[PDB]
């Protein structure tokens, strides 16, 4: 027995429009921002030399302390030319509009969820964000906006606090750093309440973010929209899409934008989503 | 738990 009448996108849409489904949690990663022209930052094309010990060091906290500058050089190299959220981002804004969105947990630092209209309380930025930066001095912690940080990144000057002249650091979580306390406190409360997990554009290979899927109640359906299947148990040591025991997990394989479009079409939301995306893209293009 | 690969 199960909440989905069938393990398909069509079954998920029927469930979402039933009274049984009131609260949706979205888990999103780099895959929902690649069509915005923001390739994954773990992808092997930024790996283009600052005497780094190995490749990971540019995003490890131990190296970043006392040797910033490589990071800030790479930040200027990879800084997006435009911040235009994708169809997937606006699909989550539509979820919020329809009263279905309990929370979006994101691994992305690119602020696109905010631009698409998700508010801070809707959002758990598990790896932090470039939206704000802070002076690293414990007694100061002056906050700076991205416009300020962008200016220092492109001047190729290490960003310094105007009050105390310490380093100013974008509010991201480096590898080797603890995730923000908000991540764990939101997780504790939210997964008591979730009716549907929407997992979009993540390979579920970064921890502890990836262990979110094991926090869902046993009945809660889980839809993966992703280029590749992910989140299955590792046979060398999860999601069960394909066995005779599968009862609640659904994988839709393709680009996240196309999968969100297909789900929106089943929900009767395709015209609303198209109108929202075209308006918001026109607005951003006209900045 | 630290952020890990
Ligand atoms: Zn300061």
B2 contacts A176? CB cut-off 8 A: yes
Cα(A35)–Cα(A14) distance, integer angstroms: 28
Chain A residues with CB-CB distance to B3 below 8 A? 127, 173-179, 206-209
Among candidate residues A186, A187, A121, A132, the one with its CA nearest the CA of residue A159: A132
CB atoms within 10 A of CB A143: 11
Q: Strand A101-106 vs strand A123-125: parallel, antiparallel, or unpaired?
A: parallel
Q: Give the Å distance between the CA of A65 and the centre of ligand 1.
A: 16
- CA dist., res. A226 & res. A228, Å (int): 5
Chain B positions with Cβ closer than 8 Å to A: 1-5
Taking residue A279's Cβ as centre, other Cβ atoms within 10 Å add up to 11
**At residue A185, what are phi and psi to the nearest 5 degrees?**
-75, -40
Q: Cα-Cα-Cα-Cα dihedral of A257, A146, A127, A59, to 10°?
A: 110
Please tell me what resolution, in angstroms, this structure has.
1.8
Give how far A187 is from chain B: nearest CA, Å: 14
For chain B, the distance separating the N- and C-terminal CA atoms, rounded to the nearest angstrom, is 12
Does B1 sit within 8 Å of A176, measured CB to CB?
A: no
Q: How was this structure determined?
A: X-ray
Q: Which residues, 6 or more positions from A130, have their beta carbon under 8 angstroms from its beta carbon?
A: A109, A110, A111, A146, A149, A170, A171, A172
Confirm or reject contact between A56 and chain B (CB < 8 A).
Answer: yes
Q: Domains of chain A: which residue ranges? A: 1-34+86-126+181-287, 35-85+127-180
For residue A54, count other CB atoms closer than 10 A to its CB.
8
Q: What are the distances in angstroms from CA A70 to CA A19, A61, A80, A191?
A: 52, 12, 18, 38
Pick from A161, A137, A139: nearest CA to A148: A161
| CB of A19 closer than 8 Å to CB of A8 | no
A12-42: burial string, b at 16+ Cβ within 10 Å, e else: bbbbbeeeebebbbbbbbbbbbbbbebebbb
Beta pairing, strands A249-253 & A24-28: unpaired
Q: Chain A: give the shortest CA distance to residue B1, in Å.
A: 6
Work out how many CB contacts closer than 8 A connect A with B.
30
Query: Does the bond joining A208 to the residue before it have cis omega, within 30 degrees of 0?
Result: yes
Angle at A89 between CA A198 and CA A234, to 5 degrees: 35
H-type alpha helices, A121-198? 146-154, 181-190
Q: How far is the CA of A211 from the centre of ligand 1 (A)?
A: 35
Longest dimension (CA), chain A: 62
**Chain-centre distance for alpha carbon A69:** 26
Q: Give the start-end residues of each E strand in A112-254.
A: 123-125, 128-135, 143-145, 168-172, 196-200, 222-226, 249-253
The residue annotated as part of the active site, out of A67, A127, A134, A142, is A127
- The answer to whether A273 and A261 are in contact (CB under 8 A) is yes
Question: Do B1 and A207 touch, CB atoms closer than 8 A?
Answer: yes
Instruction: Mark whether A142 is an active-site residue.
Output: no
Q: Which residues pair with A223 in a beta bridge?
A: A198, A250
CB contact under 8 A, A205 and B1: no
């Amino acid at each position: 027995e199960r909440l989905l009448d069938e393990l398909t996108l069509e079954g998920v849409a029927r469930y979402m429009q039933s009274e049984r489904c009131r609260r949706v949690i979205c888990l999103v990663g780099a895959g929902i921002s690649t069509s915005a022209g923001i390739p994954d930052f773990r992808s092997p094309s930024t790996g283009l030399k600052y005497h780094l010990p190995y490749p990971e060091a540019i995003f490890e906290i131990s190296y970043f302390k006392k040797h910033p500058e490589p990071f800030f050089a790479l930040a200027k190299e990879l800084y997006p030319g435009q911040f235009k959220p994708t169809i997937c981002h606006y699909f989550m804004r539509l979820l919020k509009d329809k009263g279905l969105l309990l929370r979006c947990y994101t691994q992305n630092i690119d602020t696109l969820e905010r631009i698409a209209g998700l508010e801070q309380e809707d959002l758990v930025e598990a790896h932090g964000t470039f939206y704000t930066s802070h002076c690293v001095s414990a007694s100061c912690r002056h906050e700076y906006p991205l416009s300020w940080m962008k200016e220092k990144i492109f001047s190729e000057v290490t960003p310094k606090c105007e009050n105390c002249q310490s380093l100013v650091k974008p509010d991201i979580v480096f590898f080797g750093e603890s995730l923000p306390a908000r991540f764990f406190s939101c997780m504790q409360s939210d997964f008591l309440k979730v009716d549907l997990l929407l997992v979009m554009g993540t390979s579920l290979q970064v921890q502890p973010f990836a262990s979110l899927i094991s926090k869902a109640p046993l009945s809660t359906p889980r839809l993966l929209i992703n280029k590749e299947k992910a989140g299955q148990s590792d046979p060398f040591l999860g999601m069960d899409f394909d066995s005779k025991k599968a009862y609640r997990d659904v994988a839709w394989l393709g680009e996240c934008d196309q999968g969100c479009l297909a789900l929106a079409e089943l929900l009767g939301w395709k015209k609303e989503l198209e109108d929202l995306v075209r308006r918001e893209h026109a607005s951003i293009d006209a900045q | 738990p630290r952020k890990q690969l």
